[PDB]
Nucleic acid binder design. Structure first.
Ligand SMILES: [Mg+2]
Ligand SMILES: [Mg+2]
Ligand SMILES: [Mg+2]
Ligand SMILES: [Mg+2]
Ligand SMILES: [Mg+2]
Ligand SMILES: [Mg+2]
Ligand SMILES: [Mg+2]
Ligand SMILES: [Mg+2]
Ligand SMILES: [Mg+2]
Ligand SMILES: [Mg+2]
Ligand SMILES: [Mg+2]
Ligand SMILES: [Mg+2]
Lengths: 154, 143, 110, 99, 136
RNA sequence: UGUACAACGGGGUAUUGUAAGCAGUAGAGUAGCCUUGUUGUUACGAUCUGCUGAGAUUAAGCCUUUGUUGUCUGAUUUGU
RNA sequence: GUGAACAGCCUCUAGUUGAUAGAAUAAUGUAGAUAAGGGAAGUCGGCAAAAUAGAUCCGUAACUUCGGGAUAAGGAUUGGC
């Protein structure tokens, strides 16, 4: 029993989910879902479709190369059996996932660094234009004060 | 789907794949094997006048000449440019077999890339030399 | 107490027009708005503003909005008040968006 | 064939294939591999010296942490040399304008 | 009755009715095979006999060598193109319908099979497995 | 007459495929001007990039709710 | 306006908004549609539907009353700036 990766769309494939196409070279393409599979059949580009991990890595929205990503390989030469080694692997998996999520959040917080300065600049330009729309606001606030206070006077 | 994509992309109407055509365009011996085809009764130009990028057979040689001038061929040539998107790209995008994919990428930018480009250059000048003073009618004689 | 009252509501027409024929989607929304006002104010007599009718029919017969913000106000009738001394009057409030808004009571200063 | 005869028939006797493993311990012959943990395969991570690799990873991680770009607390706002009160005022006024 | 097949065959989705053209996947000299009967099929009013991957059929040769034509021969279906289910759970399909020429005892007439072979066919027929280099 | 019921609102779960707006040493080239230029400026220019897996939709027979606002009527008949 | 076009499709001037209505969404109909793998195995009979289709360029057989057949057959294309 194995979890596979979607060929077109890079999502996990669990047992009983999706479809597989066997090409004439014994190359097997497993598909996440009918959306990823039909995009394959219509021959669309996965590096061009924006909702895929291939696009996100190639465009630099996600971190692509890291020491935490050098751990899951296809292991073709097996080791015998060792209860202690299995327990160490099961601990190291959780530690590795924790480190990887921390580094991914750090990558996002670095690439989203200018979204306070840009917002202040557009807000100050909008406020610096249209002065007489700010006098309607000044009249509206003073009308909200006096009408409520004489209603609170009652 | 509806009707159009069902009519075109049906499994018994499937066309060849980009990474297979990329491995065809590498290895100059494979280019000579694809240019010097035998006679075949079920191919349009008796197995001759074959475009390697757009993996289709032409009727005449003047048909191949106008196809090479056209705009569908330029779309396929622009598609067959960089790293050809195998399953290794999907695996490494998921975070798996990443060192193997990195070896593959540096290998294709070191060795197989300029070889493919030099074969494609030689093939373009050879086809432009051959398809120059060709008549429009064809001798049906298959020798 | 005080059976004369005004409130602002938002009605979700998208889940009330699900499956309806295209030539009848805008005539059905008028009936659903009257049913909504009858359920919320208890009144059988409901009157719609023509500006609310314009807001309903603004995109043709099959292009009704998903959400609408309404102002409903219970009032009193006049001479020959048929069988009902109260009636509801429904108006539109043209807001920026109709999403993310709760029911509010309108303080009347008139 | 004899054990199969005295433990049922031919299509009845169920053979233990783990009964001839060559392991270091003999309480280990009837264990099972975990095979899946969260969304990952255990066979993808199972290798010797994974303890050494995780040691190198955590050493690099604490070195990176003491240089410190894990500073989530990062307030170096130099907006236009404004102060936060009139910054808040400009924000609420521009929100009013676009509404 | 079921001659040459080692063991039993479980249920697989049938793809090829009587009257279908499939490819010939060995080097015996044929190009396509026209399916005229299916060995070991049930009887029902109005229902066509249909073959799936790993079945012995009776076929004729339409295109190919001039000696092979105008005679009826046994064949075995090795690629299906209609999606069936593996019991380790995935649905899967090939690119084309394809089979090889055989005698009634299950032995093969050619010497090698081109392209992949379904593992159910290769597990059901031992002489198919000995002549194929790619099994799915 | 109370984790009572409903209308909205929130949170999940799902579908699509990157909103409007603003910006740019991005952009085949063509014009205008200074000192015809070891990216000369400007003006147009399909398209591209960033803010942005964004925006929209989500029960109408999806799941869940420490929120807001309201309501909790009335008719008919039956006896050994 | 599009377009070869008094074709079809959308709009201005002018004119109409008439034809019993309301609520639901069972079966069977009438008028339309889509369908994996196969491709006439269906039927008296490819009935019906699908497929083709404008324009540019290349190319086009038997036969013939030499005028035709002929858009024979077959192929490469088409946006925006
Ligand atoms: Mg319906
Ligand atoms: Mg909700
Ligand atoms: Mg945008
Ligand atoms: Mg984006
Ligand atoms: Mg014109
Ligand atoms: Mg016209
Ligand atoms: Mg079909
Ligand atoms: Mg027939
Ligand atoms: Mg018949
Ligand atoms: Mg019959
Ligand atoms: Mg017909
Ligand atoms: Mg004719």
């Amino acid at each position: 029993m194995r979890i596979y990766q979607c060929h077109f769309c890079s999502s996990p494939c669990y047992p009983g989910h999706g479809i597989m196409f066997v090409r004439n070279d014994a190359k097997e393409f497993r598909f996440c879902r009918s959306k990823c599979h039909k995009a394959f059949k219509q021959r669309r580009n996965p590096r061009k479709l924006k909702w895929t991990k291939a696009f996100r890595k190639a465009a630099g929205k996600e971190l692509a190369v890291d020491s935490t990503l050098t751990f899951a390989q296809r292991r073709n030469v097996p080791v015998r059996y060792n209860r202690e080694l299995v327990a160490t692997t099961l601990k190291a998996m959780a530690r590795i996932e924790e480190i990887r999520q921390k580094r991914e959040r750090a990558f996002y917080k670095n690439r989203m660094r200018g979204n306070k300065e840009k917002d202040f600049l557009r807000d100050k330009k909008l406020v610096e234009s249209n002065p007489e729309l700010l006098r309607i606001r000044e009249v509206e606030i003073a009308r909200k004060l006096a009408k409520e206070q004489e209603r609170a006077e009652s | 789907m509806g009707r159009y994509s069902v009519k075109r992309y049906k499994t018994k109407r499937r066309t060849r794949d980009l990474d297979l055509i990329y491995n065809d365009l590498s290895t100059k011996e494979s280019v000579q094997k694809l240019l010097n085809q035998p006679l075949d009764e079920t191919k349009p130009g008796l197995g001759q006048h074959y475009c390697i990028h757009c993996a289709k057979y032409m009727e005449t040689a003047i048909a191949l000449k106008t196809h090479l001038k056209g705009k569908v061929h330029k779309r396929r040539v622009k598609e067959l440019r960089g790293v050809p998107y195998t399953q290794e790209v999907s695996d490494a995008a998921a975070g798996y077999n990443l060192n193997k994919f990195l070896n593959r990428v540096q290998e294709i930018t070191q060795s197989v890339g300029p070889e493919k480009e030099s074969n494609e250059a030689l093939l373009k000048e050879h086809l432009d030399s051959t398809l120059a003073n060709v008549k429009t009618t064809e001798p049906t004689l298959p020798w | 107490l005080k059976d004369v009252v005004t409130r602002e509501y938002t009605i979700n027409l998208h889940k009330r027009l699900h499956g309806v024929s295209f030539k009848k989607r805008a005539p059905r929304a008028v009936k659903e708005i009257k049913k909504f006002a009858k359920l919320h104010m208890g009144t059988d007599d409901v009157r719609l503003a023509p500006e609310l009718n314009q807001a309903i029919w603004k995109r043709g017969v099959k292009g009704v909005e998903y959400r609408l913000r309404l102002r409903i106000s219970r009032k009193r009738n006049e001479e020959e008040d048929a069988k009902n001394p109260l009636f509801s009057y429904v108006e539109p409030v043209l807001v920026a968006s109709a999403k993310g808004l709760q029911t509010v009571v309108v303080e009347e200063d008139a | 064939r004899d054990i199969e005869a005295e433990n049922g028939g031919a299509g009845v006797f169920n053979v233990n294939l783990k009964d001839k493993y060559l392991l270091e311990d003999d309480e280990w012959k009837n264990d099972i591999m975990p095979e899946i943990l969260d969304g990952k395969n255990v066979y993808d991570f199972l290798d010797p010296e994974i303890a050494a690799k995780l040691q190198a990873l955590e050493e690099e991680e604490e070195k990176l942490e003491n240089e410190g770009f894990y500073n989530s607390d990062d307030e170096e706002e130099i907006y236009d040399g404004f102060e936060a009160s009139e910054v808040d005022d400009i924000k609420e006024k521009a929100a009013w304008i676009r509404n | 009755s079921g001659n040459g097949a080692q063991g039993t065959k479980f249920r697989i989705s049938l793809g090829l009715p009587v009257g279908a053209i499939m490819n010939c996947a060995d080097n015996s000299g044929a190009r396509n095979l026209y399916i005229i009967a299916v060995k070991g099929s049930g009887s029902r009013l109005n229902r066509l006999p249909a073959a799936s991957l790993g079945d012995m059929v009776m076929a004729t040769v339409k295109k190919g060598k001039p000696e092979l034509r105008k005679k009826v021969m046994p064949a075995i279906v090795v690629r299906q193109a209609k999606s069936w289910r593996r019991r380790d759970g995935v649905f899967l399909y090939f690119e084309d319908n394809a089979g090889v020429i055989a005698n009634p005892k299950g032995e093969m007439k050619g010497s090698a099979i081109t392209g992949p072979v379904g593992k159910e066919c290769a597990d059901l027929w031992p002489r198919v497995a000995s002549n194929s280099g790619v099994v799915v």
